[PDB]
Nucleic acid binder design. Structure first.
Lengths: 95, 98, 84, 110, 311, 110, 95, 85, 97
DNA sequence: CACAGGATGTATATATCTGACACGTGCCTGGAGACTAGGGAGTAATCCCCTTGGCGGTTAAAACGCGGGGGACAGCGCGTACGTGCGTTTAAGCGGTGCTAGAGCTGTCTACGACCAATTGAGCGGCCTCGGCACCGGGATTCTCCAGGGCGGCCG
DNA sequence: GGCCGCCCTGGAGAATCCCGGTGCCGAGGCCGCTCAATTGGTCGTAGACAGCTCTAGCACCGCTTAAACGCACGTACGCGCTGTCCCCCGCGTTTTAACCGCCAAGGGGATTACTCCCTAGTCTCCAGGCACGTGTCAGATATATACATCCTGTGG
């Protein structure tokens, strides 16, 4: 019985099963995925914090996250990420 | 007989004069027009502060001067004194821009 | 008041690129450099300006301030001193 | 106290990544004094999309190698063969990933 | 250091030499020799016969001092040798008067020039000094000769600035690899002209005896024999005959002489069809000078050359 | 009211840069939940030292150029002529600063 | 009347007078120095925040600032900056 | 046991540098490449290890953990995946 | 004897080591080098195995990237052999020197 | 110099472990419901400042053209240096054991920092004002470049 | 009869530096004043410190063998040299559009109130995910080929 360590194992596994129903992930690949998710989270959060501080706001909203995504993710990745985020936020507000 | 300097000495004089100076080298109005044309593709009916255009011009000039230094080093590496597009491409590829 | 600008990349003239190269320390310049150089310049701006515009969109402003360009350059690791 | 059935915020948004965990991470990361309600949803959606894209490319790479399990080599191939992901992860080193097969045309015999 | 007038009063040798009959500053630095240097005013110093002679000119006498090793009062044979070297037995007053009578231009030139004499150098020394005297300035040739003497000459003493040595021996210049060694010193192509003008003396002409036998030979035969040696053109051959073989009929012709002729005498090549340096033009100019002046026209040529330099 | 005489924290630490302003900037910058008492003093001392060093080098450059005012060119000369300052500001562009005089040896006439 | 903006002009001028009493500054040079001070402050503060977050601390103290200075400034600059900071903290605590 | 390690840079053998170059696409290697590569590797490792030990000292630890190396690499803009998070 | 020509084995090695993913430097010498370097900074240090593995991964990636840049620089000079000046040029352009 | 055969990797097929991954289970701690309050932010109205646009004279700079000289580029020769292969030697690798330094968690509590009411002076803004710097004129110094210099042998 | 071999001073001409008067506008100092830094308490909890546990790191040993090391031979290649030719530099002339000053209009950036709704903060409750077991099958290993590829002699 020690301190529980959180990670994105279950969520990455669920996403992989949704994409490829008959493909697995090794432990090293899962660790790389955890590091990738954490790094992207840190990048987006830092850009959102910078945007909030520059505009003299004290909150991070979906607008700040969208601007951060458009600044960080290049090319069609930015467009698709914006579309996915907008769809998720609209569905969340609807329900 | 007219007095003509040999090919190269005027180039060195220009190098010394421009490295001794600090003023901007690209003309203001053409660069401003280029900035506005590029910004048109992102948002229509935009406005620019004068300081914004000056900052863009200084950043562009610094970037181009650094790129030309790297290009000159690449050209000298190939036992040449003339810079060519291949040198610029190599410098950009080493720096990771391509 | 509609004014559309086109073919302004030729405004960066050959002597301007030569002066920039001389500032960099170049003795001889090939004839094909200039066009190449122009493209590079465009690409550079096509990044920086884009980021600046994004900041201008986030503030609900219609003008591009100097701080917008400074932040855009800071994103690319090109910190600029002298504009705030 | 029997309240209404608890539904996860990930379920409300239709997402798989944890909205609550991302909300807590934002609140504890000192990013701002306040965090909006929709910011965790947006961030989770973006992360889920990026993970889905990279995993799809990695799975295609693994299938091309006649293996049914993603190893770091497949992740490296997926990242480097895709232009946008490579630009996103240009300064990132993937452990045990190797390098893309690339021999210059000059070095080949003729 | 070089002896000054107040250095060693008992180490001088005075010979009768009036100022009108000789000008030290108008002869030695006028390209007639490339082994004399000036440190103090009215002083010259050069190595001849393995002895360093320093010369100064007074109002009516010429003073000389000798470096060897620690003895004074030079023997009269040295005085006879230097008198032969300076042609003290020949009086230039009669020649100047005759030239002024026949042509007033020389008198106009000699209005301020009086005493541009000629030397009688050792044939080997003069020949090897004038071999490297083609298409160069006087200072360059003098430095070249000094460096050659330092490289291939037996040193005598260091005169507080630079060692003084005797003239290089003929045996040491006829050996192999001499051309490359002298080109390392900086003699240029003329270095090769030294080698081809040394070995042929002993291996193709008959040694020093053949060269010395031309002092009493005829003018044309001696001139042709000198011209046979590689690198010895007409001008240097005439200079050697005049200043090393006692041939007053030899009149050197060169760019300075040609400029003087075309700017003051207006002489033009009649038989020759051009105005460039050629043996035919040299012969025509020599014949014209001999006809206009006489058999001693070489002295007048030297006077004009000295006047041309100081203008 | 009659309190003790107000003594600034900058004077207490013998510094010129403002300790109170740095404390406020750290507190409002969302860097940590709490900010210690000595952290503003340490940061102010570090900033004052760096400013003093760069200004000393800039003033030396100005004196070498026979001028009594520091301009951007002098700052550029000071930064690029010192190895440590150049390393600290490697990716920094100074406005109106120009470049160091540096012509490659191959290009010089010989 | 407008909203007043803060800058490090007076402190930079005082430091310059202490270093070079008979030397002046220009407006462009003052702006450049202000930008430099802001950039160094941001670097050190961000590094200290990362250090505090990594070690599960919640307070930025002089120790975190010292570690950030060591991580950022190269060579003798770090040593002299640490010396100056230690002297300042000791004087502040003594008085 | 107090032991001091010296002259261990030669442990990066010539075949190891050759294999690293082969992975990079190098076909021919000059003989002076190896010493320069050793120097470059030593400089890189010194830069990373200084930061890692700084992080370890700040945490009042005597063991250099993997996260310290990851943070040191992240400072130099060389983020490494697969060793925690 | 069946000696291969000078360079076909090099291409074969290039293919083999670009297809593979294992570490190329021996683990123990690299570990000793890391410990020797760390001795100068703080005496009596201990390392986790994961720390040394991460250091080796980073070192190998950096060296491979530098060798790719060096190869590009060498090919730019119409040569197929890498020389120390190529590494110096690559590191100068990258900004490391 | 094209090509068939010999020799060497190389990928494809198949049996055979095995240990790493996918799935099932207990539970606890972190997330979800419900409610409150207070401040951050959205919105409307206004001041006015900074940007945009037009215009004409001035002239500096860009564009065009031409001659040629210096550099790029291709070819060729050669000699050292590096690839390739084989026999020896080294020490890396693996597993096994043993010890213990130190990472990691827990409990106290104390001192340190957040927060608030009250002052007050340091620093921002506005306004002189004079001296440092940009500049023009003229002269001296310095840097670059080519012709000619006591020419001679030669292939036109 | 030009012409280049070898190169070395001497002017000629152009660029640059130095000195001094002019003048102008921005850096520096002063001065009122408003808001943020400082005082003085008070309270809540962050972490410093002591203590205990048990993990993983360090050290050593045997002993297998893969890999490094040294060496010999040969040839692909880097490097120096030469020749050709072409294109970029230097300079003069013509065009053009940048620059500067002026003017005017108005877009929107920035400030101020006013309100409202959205998120932090509490308390309670429960189930989602994390640690732990465990079975089994995808991958690594080994062996056995069928084929791709490289290199070289014979043949014309």
């Amino acid at each position: 019985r020690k301190t529980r360590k959180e990670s994105y194992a279950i969520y990455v596994y669920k996403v992989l099963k949704q994409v490829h129903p008959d493909t697995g992930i090794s432990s090293k690949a899962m660790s790389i995925m955890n590091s990738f998710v954490n790094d992207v989270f840190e990048r987006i959060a830092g850009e959102a914090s910078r945007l909030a501080h520059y505009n003299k706001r004290s909150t991070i909203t979906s607008r700040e996250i969208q601007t951060a995504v458009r600044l960080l993710l290049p090319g069609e990745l930015a467009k698709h990420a914006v579309s996915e985020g907008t769809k998720a936020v609209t569905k969340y507000t609807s329900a | 007989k007219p007095h003509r300097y040999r090919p190269g000495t005027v180039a060195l004089r220009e190098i010394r004069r421009y490295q001794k100076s600090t003023e901007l080298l690209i003309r203001k109005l053409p660069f401003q027009r280029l900035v506005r044309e590029i910004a048109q593709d992102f948002k229509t009916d935009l406005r620019f502060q004068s300081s914004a255009v000056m900052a863009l011009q200084e950043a562009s000039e610094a970037y181009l001067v650094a790129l030309f230094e790297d290009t000159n080093l690449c050209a000298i590496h190939a036992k040449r004194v003339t810079i060519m597009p291949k040198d610029i491409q190599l410098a950009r590829r080493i720096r990771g821009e391509r | 008041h509609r004014k559309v600008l086109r073919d302004n990349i030729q405004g960066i003239t050959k002597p301007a690129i030569r002066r920039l190269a001389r500032r960099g320390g170049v003795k001889r310049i090939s004839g094909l450099i200039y066009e190449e150089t122009r493209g590079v310049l465009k690409v550079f701006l096509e990044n920086v300006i884009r980021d600046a515009v994004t900041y201008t969109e986030h503030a609900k402003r219609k003008t591009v301030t100097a701080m917008d360009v400074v932040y855009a350059l800071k994103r690319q690791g090109r910190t600029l001193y002298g504009f705030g | 106290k029997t309240r209404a059935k608890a539904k996860t915020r990930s379920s409300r948004a239709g997402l798989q990544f944890p909205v609550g965990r991302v909300h807590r991470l934002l609140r504890k990361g000192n990013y701002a004094e306040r965090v909006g309600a929709g910011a965790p949803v947006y961030l989770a959606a973006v992360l889920e999309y990026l993970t889905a894209e990279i995993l799809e490319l990695a799975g295609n790479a693994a299938r091309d190698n006649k293996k049914t399990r993603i190893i770091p080599r497949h992740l490296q191939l997926a990242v480097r063969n895709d232009e946008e992901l490579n630009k996103l992860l240009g300064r990132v080193t993937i452990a045990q990933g190797g390098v893309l097969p690339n021999i210059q045309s000059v070095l080949l015999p003729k | 250091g070089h002896r000054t007038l107040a250095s060693t009063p008992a180490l001088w040798a005075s010979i009768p030499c009036p100022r009108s009959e000789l000008r030290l500053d108008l002869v030695l630095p006028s390209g007639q020799s490339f082994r004399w240097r000036e440190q103090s005013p009215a002083h010259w110093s050069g190595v001849l016969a393995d002895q360093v002679w320093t010369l100064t000119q007074t109002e009516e006498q010429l003073h000389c001092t000798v470096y060897r090793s620690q003895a004074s009062r030079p023997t009269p044979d040295e005085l006879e040798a230097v008198r032969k070297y300076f042609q003290l037995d020949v009086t230039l007053a009669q020649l100047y008067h005759h030239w002024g009578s026949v042509d007033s231009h020389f008198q106009e030139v000699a209005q301020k020039f009086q005493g541009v004499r000629l030397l009688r150098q050792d044939p080997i020394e003069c020949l090897f000094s004038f071999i490297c005297s083609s298409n160069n300035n006087i200072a360059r040739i003098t430095g070249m000769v000094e460096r050659l003497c330092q490289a291939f000459g037996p040193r005598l003493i260091q005169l507080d600035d630079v060692t003084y040595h005797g003239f290089p021996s003929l045996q040491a210049l006829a050996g192999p690899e001499v051309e490359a060694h002298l080109r390392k010193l900086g003699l240029g192509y003329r270095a090769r002209y030294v080698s081809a003008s040394a070995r042929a003396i002993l291996e193709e002409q008959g040694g020093l005896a053949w060269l010395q036998q031309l002092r009493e030979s005829s003018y044309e035969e001696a001139h042709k024999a000198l011209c046979i040696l590689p690198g010895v053109g007409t001008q240097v051959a005439d200079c050697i005959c005049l200043m090393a073989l006692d041939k007053p009929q030899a009149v050197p012709v060169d760019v300075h002489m040609w400029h003087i002729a075309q700017r003051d005498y207006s002489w033009h090549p009649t038989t020759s069809q051009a105005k460039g340096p050629s043996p035919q033009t040299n012969k025509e100019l020599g014949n014209f000078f001999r006809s206009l002046w006489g058999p001693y026209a070489g002295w007048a040529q030297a006077v004009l050359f000295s006047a041309d330099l100081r203008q």
